[PDB]
From a paper:
The bacterial flagellar motor is a huge bidirectional rotary nanomachine that drives rotation of the flagellum for bacterial motility. The cytoplasmic C ring of the flagellar motor functions as the switch complex for the rotational direction switching from counterclockwise to clockwise. The basal body is made up of the LP ring, MS ring, C ring, rod and export apparatus. Here, we present two high-resolution cryo-electron microscopy structures of the C ring-containing flagellar basal body–hook complex from Salmonella Typhimurium, which are in the default counterclockwise state and in a constitutively active CheY mutant-induced clockwise state, respectively.
Residue numbers in the entry:
A (entry chain A), B (entry chain h), C (entry chain g), D (entry chain f), E (entry chain B): 229 to 305, 353 to 439
């Protein structure tokens, strides 16, 4: 029931990422000379979070006060000195409440496998690509897939001649 | 259901960013001599936040007072001196409450992949572009995509001859 | 639903900024010899804010009083002196409450990409523009776009010959 | 909905400022020899403010009193002197409450771009204008646009020959 | 009843992972020259979790205070010294409540078995593959299956000639 809807959601996301990669990889490598497939680890767990933050007021310069009683006594007779300080302070503090409801269906970790073809010249020899072109393909695929390191995304692009 | 609506929202945003990039990249590079694709990491999490800020009043110059009782006693007989100061102060403080409801569907991180063609002169030789022109394309794409560093936007523009 | 309305709002704002830029850039550069595209980062977050400000009254010259009790005693017998001052003061303070509801749909950051053509004389040679003319175009575009530094606006105008 | 009404309001304000500038710039520069465009940053945020002001009464000359108790005692026996002064004062203070509801749709910052043509004499040579005439145009545009420094208004008028 | 639905859910997930692997393994190894099967250990246990986190306030620099009473007494007569410090502090602490409902049907551990064929040249000799090609197949399968180490995923790809 709901599981099938989630699976179809994942399939559509993967297909659209695949198409976005193919769109940029087509003009330079050529139609059919590139194949990519995407798998997506998604987030279907309902989470609700409330965050409370208090600004520190331990420093007297940023401390906000409402009432303060400072009783000071010094009975000098060091000799028979007698110092007494009774201090009472009531503070008002900065407060920030944030309520967050995470979206259901977010992407947790995306791994993408891309395979490119060789280059057959007018003679027909399948000449492999170069390192610079491979780096360009890797960068383009990283851009298309929305590659990020916080998610833990992995990308692998290899070059090999396609079968007949 | 709602996930499909969010996905269509993302697709429309990406398509419009793509079209905006293509619009400026067309007059100089030429029709079809430029291809770009956009992926968008969006924000579909409902967040509500209330912020409270208190202006500090620790300095006597900016401190606002309502009532103040200052009892001072000095019984000089340092000898048998006896100083006593009882101070009570009630303050009124500046207060700022901000209530914020973040919009659903905002952009978190935008990465854009752009590929340009080579230059075929009247002879037909695919002459590659220059560094200055590449920098101009990068700047134009950054302007079109709304490039920002707080979001974490990444842009990659590479030059390569298009396939037939 | 609402997201589409927000997107159409952004598109209309961007189109009108584009048209305003084109309107001034047309008479001097010429029809079609200028192309500009605008992207707008907008504010669709409902914010409500209440601000309270108290005027400081720590200086006796600007302090407003309602009731004041000053008991002073000096029993001179420094010898066996005995000074005692009990002071109680009730103040009235200036107060300013400001309630603000920010508009939904305001502009946060505007970045604009403008491209101009070269100058083809009667012979037909595409002569590039000059530095003074480029500075004039930059100033005119800044004026049209409502360029501001608090928002974080970025503008890029480059000169390049248009393709056929 | 409301955003479109606000945008149309901004467009009408900008168009009327443009027409006012054109009206004075026409008789001297000539019909069509002047083009101006206006952009307006407006205020669509509902603000409500209540201000309370108390006149200071720390000086005995401007202090208004309702009741005053002054107990003075001097038991001279400096010797065994004993001075005691108990003073209680109740004041009445001046008070001014101001309640302000700012208008929705006010102008925050106006920037205007104006371009003028060259002067083609009977021979047809496009003779540029002079510094005095440019200063006069700048002053007239500042007057028409309602130029102010508190708002942060910026004006740019440049001279360049119009294209065919 | 529900068990059959869960089993069909597992079968669909396994089939889609199998198809994703086959899709990338087809262009290089060839149609039919690759066979893969997937088994999935799934999560059909309903879990609900509430998390509470308190920011530490043991350091006086990050400690937020509401009321503080500090009575200090020093009766010097080390001699007959008498120090007494009574300190009472009330703190306000940061608080974060997270409520999480894990999705039913998540993947716990995925193990995948892939078998590839040999290479029969024009002569017909079944030449085995190379180490580099095997490593490429392993990497592609890891990318397709969403291989992760936290889950405990295991992958085994072996090379052997297919039977008639």
């Amino acid at each position: 029931d709901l599981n099938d809807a989630q699976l179809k959601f994942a399939n559509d996301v993967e297909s659209r990422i695949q198409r976005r990669i193919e769109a940029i990889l087509s003009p330079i490598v050529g139609n059919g000379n590139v194949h990519a497939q995407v798998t997506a680890q998604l987030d279907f767990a309902n989470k609700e979070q409330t965050e409370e933050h208090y600004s520190p007021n331990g420093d007297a310069s940023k401390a906000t006060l409402r009432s303060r009683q400072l009783n000071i006594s010094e009975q000098v007779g060091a000799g028979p000195r007698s110092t007494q300080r009774n201090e009472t302070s009531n503070y008002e503090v900065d407060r920030t409440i944030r309520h967050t409801k995470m979206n259901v269906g977010d992407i947790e970790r995306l791994s993408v496998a891309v395979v490119v073809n060789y280059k057959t010249l007018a003679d027909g020899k399948p000449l492999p690509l170069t390192a610079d072109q491979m780096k360009q393909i890797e960068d383009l695929t990283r851009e298309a897939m929305g590659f990020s390191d916080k998610r833990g995304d992995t990308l692998n692009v290899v070059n090999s001649p396609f079968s007949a």
